[PDB]
Amino acid sequence: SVVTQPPSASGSLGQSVTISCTGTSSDVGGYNYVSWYQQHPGKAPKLMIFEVSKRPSGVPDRFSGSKSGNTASLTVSGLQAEDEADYYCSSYAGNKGVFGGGTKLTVL
Amino acid sequence: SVVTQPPSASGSLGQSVTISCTGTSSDVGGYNYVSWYQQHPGKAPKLMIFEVSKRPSGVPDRFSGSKSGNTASLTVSGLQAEDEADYYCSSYAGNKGVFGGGTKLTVL
Amino acid sequence: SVVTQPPSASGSLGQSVTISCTGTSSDVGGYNYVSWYQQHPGKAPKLMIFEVSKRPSGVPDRFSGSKSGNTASLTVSGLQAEDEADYYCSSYAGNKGVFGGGTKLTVL
Amino acid sequence: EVQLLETGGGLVQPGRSLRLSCAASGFPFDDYAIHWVRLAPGKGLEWVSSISWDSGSIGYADSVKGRFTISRDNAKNSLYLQMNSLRAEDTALYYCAKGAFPGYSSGWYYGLDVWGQGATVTVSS
Amino acid sequence: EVQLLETGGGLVQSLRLSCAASGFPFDDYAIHWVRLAPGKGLEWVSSISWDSGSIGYADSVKGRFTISRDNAKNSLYLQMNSLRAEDTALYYCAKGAFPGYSSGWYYGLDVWGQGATVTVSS
Amino acid sequence: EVQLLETGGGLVQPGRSLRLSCAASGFPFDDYAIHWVRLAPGKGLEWVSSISWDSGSIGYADSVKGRFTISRDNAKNSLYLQMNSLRAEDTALYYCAKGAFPGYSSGWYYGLDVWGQGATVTVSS
Amino acid sequence: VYAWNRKRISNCVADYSVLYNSASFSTFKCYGVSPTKLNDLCFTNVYADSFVIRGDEVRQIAPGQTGNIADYNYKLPDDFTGCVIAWNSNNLDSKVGGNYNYLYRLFRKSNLKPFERDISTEIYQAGSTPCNGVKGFNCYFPLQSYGFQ
């Protein structure tokens, strides 16, 4: 299927930016298994959020996850220079997974 | 199966030569779908006759096809230098095709 | 299955050495179809004994076969320099065959 | 223009495998059935295999039946021939040829009008 | 350390990809393929359980790709036949946080390889 | 003279495939059953597979059952062994051997009198 | 064994009880019928197949068996319904110098069908060249002697 994601996001240094991730009732709104990934240029993706709002070890508290209906959101408070990257959301869909389109985050 | 063809044929410049192509009642004598192909050395075959006696566009009137029982014939009148080549006949055989042995044509 | 064979055997020049070949009641002890093979280094195996104790043409009388229960034996009397090689036993097992582990024979 | 180009030839020992490819262009590969024909040295043409536009109809010669495997990828406009357990008599010049009309047996009905340059296959020890 | 390395990339007008694994028990974990198309985002390709008992493909490559593995060689494979222009992407080898099949979707894909480039053009 | 020659050896990764061939001459290949026997480095001989004169009787070892596929072409006097999904323990020297008498189990009854030179097969990553 | 004798028994009362208690049998195995039930059964015909073999070959006389005797001399069907009795005959079929009268078939192109008797003595062609009734290399006499002592 398709998980809708805005192509670009922006926020100033120290500010906050929310990146939405919109699916359907069979993926994003059907389970609490939404993941978020960060990808710097030329490097492999990095797991930032799993199970909608859980953070792995090594992810700062600035990244936080939430979900509401068919829309999952990733909020990055206290934006920093190293946060500029691409962000994809993932969701379970019944023995299959699906990624979002991706959002380029520019720290202005 | 096997479609019998004489190994070599010959004819003088401006004369005529007939190349026979003998099959059985399940191929040459079972359908009106006999084809003839010309192959110059080092080059891909060229379709000269289809449906026993039909000529594609680009084939001179000097080449003509006929069939009689299990034997199909290719006649080349007004033989020319460029006609020296190998000639194979083809026939339908029921969801399968079969070629003749081939005949080398020498223009004497 | 597995046919037990001692890894190494030894005997002095002119002496005798017996190489045992132990199976079960479904192979070595179930039929009288035990074979013995000699393999010199870098060369294909050579049939030395068939049917427990029969010698093909070209095998000297120094090699002799015997069987007792689940244990077949190959005795090489008057040991010679050319007898140094690897020896494998074979046995029928019901539409299938099985070889022994093999024994390196050193002529001391 | 219409064009077919065979790739994947070479020498390979008796019993080994080899895969041939045929790249197509200049015509709608989506709809036409394509065929393999080989030319053995000293012998003549010999039909190898055939496959319809959707792979719903597949045929092999008795000499390669259960030996070769024909297939195609309409998105890549490519035809394939997987040759396993090759024999000395498989040494030939393999041609990729399309029919005059997109039907399976239509290449036998109206002839094979377009041929590739061929790829050489040698099977010797 | 945990490590995955993809090999077998290049330009092609079939193609087989390999993923060498080390640093973790490859015998028990399910592994997945994810590609990154130029201009687009990530897209899941295929998945295979520890014993190959569970196998899944995306609809865009279903009946087209063939995933497999060799636990003795700690290697994952992806046989791509009949490649299309839209198959041009950067293919990643990724393991899940827990050895279950869908567990990589449950808890995320924590380890990724460097990827192998695949170009499909005439 | 009687003669058997195996071809198709080489190195291949664990999980891949490889096909072996055995060319026969000097005796009536039409009537005899032929067998495959391998020699693993450090281990001894190990029977692989067997096939009767008309392929009516076929047997495999439990270690390669459902893994190898034996076949023959009596017209080409050739025996084949299709090895798929190869493992490290498949690394061995594969022999082509005929029996003393043309029967299937006769090679076990009276021994395997003729052996080929063998073809090396390595299965490592 | 290659020329195993057969006797057809019909229109008579069979005495199985006395038959099985007359001599001492070293092997007595029945398939598809018990020895004691034959006293109550009637049959269209009975066949008594008699021959001599090696002791180690006695195991080959049974359903689903394979070997030289089973394949080329005397074959029983897998669904054989009947009895096999065997007893040592060393005091009868053995000579000081060796009893070579008893023979068995060694070479044969194909296995025998059940209850099939082959008495052919044609030279066996083990190679491509024809033998033309001359035994030599790749041309072997099909029969071999036991030579009991």
Author numbering:
A (entry chain E), B (entry chain G), C (entry chain L): 2 to 109
D (entry chain F), F (entry chain H): 1 to 125
E (entry chain D): 1 to 13, 17 to 125
G (entry chain B): 347 to 495
Q: Paper's wording?
A:
S is the major surface glycoprotein on the SARS-CoV-2 virion and is involved in viral attachment to target cells via the interaction of cell-surface-expressed angiotensin-converting enzyme 2 (ACE2) with the receptor binding site, at the tip of the receptor binding domain (RBD), in the S1 fragment of S (Lan et al., 2020). Following attachment, cleavage of S releases S1, allowing a major conformational change in S2, exposing a hydrophobic loop that executes fusion of viral and host cell membranes, releasing the viral genome to initiate viral replication (Walls et al., 2017). In-depth structure-and-function analyses of 27 potent RBD-binding mAbs isolated from vaccinated volunteers following breakthrough Omicron-BA.1 infection reveals that they are focused in two main clusters within the RBD, with potent right-shoulder antibodies showing increased prevalence. In summary, we have presented a structure-function analysis of potent human antibodies induced by Omicron BA.1 breakthrough infection in SARS-CoV-2 vaccinated individuals.
The first antibody cluster includes the IGHV3-53 and IGHV3-66 type antibodies and is toward the back of the neck/left shoulder, extending up to the top of the left shoulder. This region corresponds to the major epitope for potent neutralizers in our early pandemic antibody panel. We have determined structures for five mAbs within the neck/left shoulder cluster: Omi-2, -9, -12, −25, and −42. Some broadly neutralize all VoC, while others are sensitive to the mutations at residue 417 and 484 found in Beta and Gamma (explained for Omi-25 in Figure S4A). (I) cryo-EM maps for complexes of Omi-2, -38 and −42 with Beta S (shown in gray), RBD in cyan and Fab in purple.
